[PDB]
Design a protein around this ligand. Sequence first.
Ligand code: NDP
Ligand code: 6VG
Length: 1383
Amino acid sequence: YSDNVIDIDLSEDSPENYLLEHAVDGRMLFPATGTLVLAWKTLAKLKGVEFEQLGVQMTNVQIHQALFLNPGGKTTVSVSVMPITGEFQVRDGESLISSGVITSSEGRLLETDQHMKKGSVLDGKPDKELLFTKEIYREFLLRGYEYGAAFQGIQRASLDATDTDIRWDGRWISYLDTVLQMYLLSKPGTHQALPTLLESVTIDPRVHPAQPPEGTTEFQVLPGKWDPVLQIAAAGGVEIRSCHSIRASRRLNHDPPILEDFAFAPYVDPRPSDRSAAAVTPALRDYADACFEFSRQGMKRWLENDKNNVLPNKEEIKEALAMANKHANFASAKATLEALVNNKNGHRLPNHGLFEMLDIAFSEPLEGDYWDRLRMKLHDVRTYLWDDPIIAALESPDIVKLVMETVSDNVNQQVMEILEVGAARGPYYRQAIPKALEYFSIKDWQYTVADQGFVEDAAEFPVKMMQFDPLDPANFPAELTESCDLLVLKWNLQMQVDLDAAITEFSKMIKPGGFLLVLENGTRLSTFFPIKAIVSASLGGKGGPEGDRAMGCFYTDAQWSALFARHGFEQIMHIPDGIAVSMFLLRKPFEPSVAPIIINVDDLECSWLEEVQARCAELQDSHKDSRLWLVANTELSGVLGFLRSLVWEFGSEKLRCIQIDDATAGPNPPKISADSADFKELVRKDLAYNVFKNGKWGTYRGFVISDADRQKERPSEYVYADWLSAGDMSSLRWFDSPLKTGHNNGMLGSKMAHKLETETCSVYYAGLNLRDIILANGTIQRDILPEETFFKEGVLGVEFSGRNSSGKRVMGLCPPPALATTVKCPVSSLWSVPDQWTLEEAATVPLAYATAYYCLVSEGGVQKGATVFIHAGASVVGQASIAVALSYNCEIFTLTKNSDETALLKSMYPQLNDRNFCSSEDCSFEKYIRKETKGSGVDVVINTLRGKFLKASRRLLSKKGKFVDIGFKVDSNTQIAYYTREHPDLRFQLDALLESQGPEWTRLFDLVQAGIHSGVVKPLKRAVYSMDKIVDAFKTVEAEREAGKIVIKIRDEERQKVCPTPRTSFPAIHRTCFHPDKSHILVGGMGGMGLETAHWMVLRGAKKLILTSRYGITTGYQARKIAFFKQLGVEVEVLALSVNTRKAADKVFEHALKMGPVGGIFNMAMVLYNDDFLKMNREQFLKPLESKITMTMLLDDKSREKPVRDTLDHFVMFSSLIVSGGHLGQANYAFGSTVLEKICERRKRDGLPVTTPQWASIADVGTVATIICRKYPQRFFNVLSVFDFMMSSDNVVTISYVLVEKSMGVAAGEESMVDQVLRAVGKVLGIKDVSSVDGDKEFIDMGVDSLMSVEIKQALERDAGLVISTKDTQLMTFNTLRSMVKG
Ligand SMILES: NC(=O)C1=CN([C@@H]2O[C@H](COP(=O)(O)OP(=O)(O)OC[C@H]3O[C@@H](n4cnc5c(N)ncnc54)[C@H](OP(=O)(O)O)[C@@H]3O)[C@@H](O)[C@H]2O)C=CC1
Ligand SMILES: *P(=O)(O)OCC(C)(C)[C@@H](O)C(=O)NCCC(=O)NCCSC(C)=O
């Protein structure tokens, strides 16, 4: 000698550790079939039998939450099976994780006879007609389902996935999941579907084979079958009937990718159009002038009002006015600058810092204790100068990265040593680290700050503090000699009395081949002086041959150059920010002792491989002064990426580059040839990469693209409303609409059967219904809508009012998205606006009355004089129902929230009296309605309320009475009724009718048309919201705080009645779309990236694909996907040829033009031979070069002639990060990739479309099928998210790579529970740094969805003792979050 507390041991060697091998987007969930084996093992205990000798049949199994497993942890769950009836729970405390009805039995329970099949039907088939375990679980991985070797049961399957071979290893949770995978494998797609309701599961172990013999290694495989007629996935002694799932937002396993623009930047004196030029916008120029005037007059007032003579450096102050007037009221100065500050015209500098401290240094009363007193006030607002547009113009992320990386390319060590002497006055770590150094992956860095004392602001940075006087040479610690590769001198070499002595000592600290970074004032030297004399104590700087220091510290920019040049310093970069400070990157000259060796690389046929190979072999045998110079005087040449890869195996101490771009070379092309003039200048600087482009020497650098630029809005003619993140109403934006191509996305599958006639109408007003709010806020997934909308771009908006193609005014309902600026409305759904309604009023009529007629006349069959009960009389559907019922001469009973709604309805309908209204707050209407109707009941009920109001409404139904239920938020039991066909689902019927537009719709169309003519259909009261307030409008609909219709105003109605709509553009976010009438060539599109991106193009509009591969279809994965595209309605064609000759190119474009005009050319072909450079012969060096040189050039040629030039829209050439960072062994691949990018850059020069993605590592599909160069591989769904941005952008080459960290690895100190949960809860929301976000912003404002709310609530229980409700996690901030744990 409740009913079962079951514990799952997730330990190192526990038998249930395999449950960790079942994840979904990194998170580890408890399988949906684990609640069946838990109820089946609890009924067996209840019946006193072994669980493997009991035959059960679970029905209507539901899953309400998801247990979140955890490595090395114990999770408990309580099952409870009701003895007689058979109702079971899997409760996990007070929260339900699953439910259903388990009912054991003895007779036969299995419906399908698969339990008798013995052998496998997938025998003797070719390998191209079969899917193996590698290919089956590549498809699941793409959708987020990550299964380990334990859950990888399906060992083989057919192309249609009907027949499979399932491994039987004796683990039932694993086995059942491998049978549920059959249902998953039968619904190809790209979204992540989470099972929620298994209608009928039948497990019969009596017919199942026995447990495998102990120690077995060759587990037997049972045949499996999928039955689409009945939706039964049967295998062995298991049968899972109809299952249902819900789309779930895919979560990013890693941190967001780092997008960059691989662009050329000049070294010295960049022009305003160059990327290394200081970002001095006209507004900043005005501020610089504005601050100059305020400083100057404040300088003069200082002189006059200093009657106490308590102003130090007064002689220096006087000199400032002398220079200020030479290089040229106080209240007006404040007025002008204050106007600049207080203005909010969009053109607004990030902050106005220099003025504020100048004001603080001028507004201070001139009394005793001035010098020391004011020193403290400004030292308190020192940050204002540091973060100030005027100063942060030579420290913009572009320039800082250029300095740090260009130094890194030339430093021939593994650790980059930096030294910022004088980090207390002018800090550079706060800019160098977050903007340039944190992105380093191939090279390590070691920052070291130094000043007189402790640098307080450097406490939080990964720098090393050092104590030594910076402004006193001859005492600099001798241990600093040859200690740094880079020496930063931000506002330091101006405060040393003898700068001639200053750098002489500094030049000894730099390593041989090191650099000096110098940032000093060089212009408008009277602007920053008011706040310099009063800080600096010994303002006694001595002059020199270059002149006399301005005031006593500064040297003019042209005189800084003279000093360094005189002392033997080569200017590497001299970016002369023209407003104030100027930059100087200097390196000591290199004097070679052996003649450098130049080798021409121009040839694209690699006729130079042998010469380069021999010299490269002689590198590590010569002087330290021997250098190999690979040169090239052509735009098309892969020297820049080729050298990067050679350095990865030979070191950067002997390899140099020179490339001259002929197209952009200036009037005087550099004549680099052995003993030349220009060449000798390069040898002295000794820069690893020298590129002559746009007329100046420079280098290629990856400039970061801010996260805000990915959502930058640009004008677009056709736009539509969608959500950036599902389930968020605050994420609604306007995207580019596919209607710019003429057609509408989603013409695949069912939508291809109904060939409706459509009219292209220009939307003027769009009405918002409660159907849109229910979809936007995540209350209902987009899968509940008719299946014709599955592939549509959006699902928001149905009704509208605008002008058809002829200029006539119209209104009507169309399949979504009608919340756009152009719609293709079927001609059978278009009414005409009578010439008395404004288009604003017509936007309120169509759906409200179409639903009202459907409910009353079409579904309830209302008759004259019948009684009707309408819920929510104040709603737009409710107001329409009252109007229609009144026209039918009925007795109306309505529910109103408050008295204001009653007042509105009585005024709107004078017929209604107070007797016809009730209260929606409590269920007292049932008594009143039954009494007032004398017990006969109501003939029709239009029901929207739920719970006890729904039951009460049904009980008022007459003997014939009809119940029309149009509520959206149905209960789980009600939803199962819809699935079971027990009840009809009428809440998405207007949507269903509009897709078909059959006899049932035409009845409503005629009804509403007659209603308009007879005066019953009248416009409703409305509130108009501008397009940009779309988010605000949606919230107002959801709140239901006031009665009325909400219509978004797209355009302005013209005074005429038949007039063309003017062409105008709307701000919108990018959304790439492909013309369905054009043919897209995907060269090498049968690979891993090509097949999964071709799917992406199909969803976005493409319907004519030509996939070319060297061999054609050769595997079961390729044959299955091609079959999927063709079934959808795509006109695919696989060509088994290689485009390496003109004839092959002609063939490809003969087939392409046969399908239709060419509208896209992609090249994802790749053959890679990895080996050591010195062990490559020519035949092996040009292996990758065929697909990346011999292919792109031929494709480029055909994309320049007619008719391809005019019709072509996209020209994508996939590249690799090897061109930007280099890699070991793939020297040939680097040469091929670099030439490919130089071809793409040429196209951009001629104005042709071009896009060159540069990926680092792609996870789900590709050659990876983990951490390379400290770079994580991207999930493919994220690749296509940034790929979309790449196409809709102006740059040519974009770099996308995911960084493991910026040092997190081996770095942490969390301890208190009050912080342990924060990182967990912060991680759940996808916030890498919890403290970064606001401590008062509600979680729903961040976009807290469900599953993400479930995890937070479950995480609190698992991590602490808190038990909260999901209703609070969406209104429960970070500050209140931290309070609960402590309590
Ligand atoms: N880790 C990654 O996945 C990365 C990918 N990239 C780029 O992505 C692109 C594709 O990646 P992936 O798809 O994984 O490469 P795969 O090797 O996965 O597939 C490459 C495809 O190229 C096709 N191909 C090769 N040569 C030719 C040719 N001469 N004519 C026609 N087709 C050809 C092959 O078809 P067959 O097999 O029939 O010859 C093969 O299916 C490549 O260009 C690569 O540079 C960039 C960075 C990293
Ligand atoms: P919101 O949309 O309210 O979230 C509802 C959720 C939590 C998703 C719930 O309805 C649900 O279905 N939870 C997940 C069920 C589950 O256990 N799935 C995992 C096993 S199946 C597998 C392939 O993931």
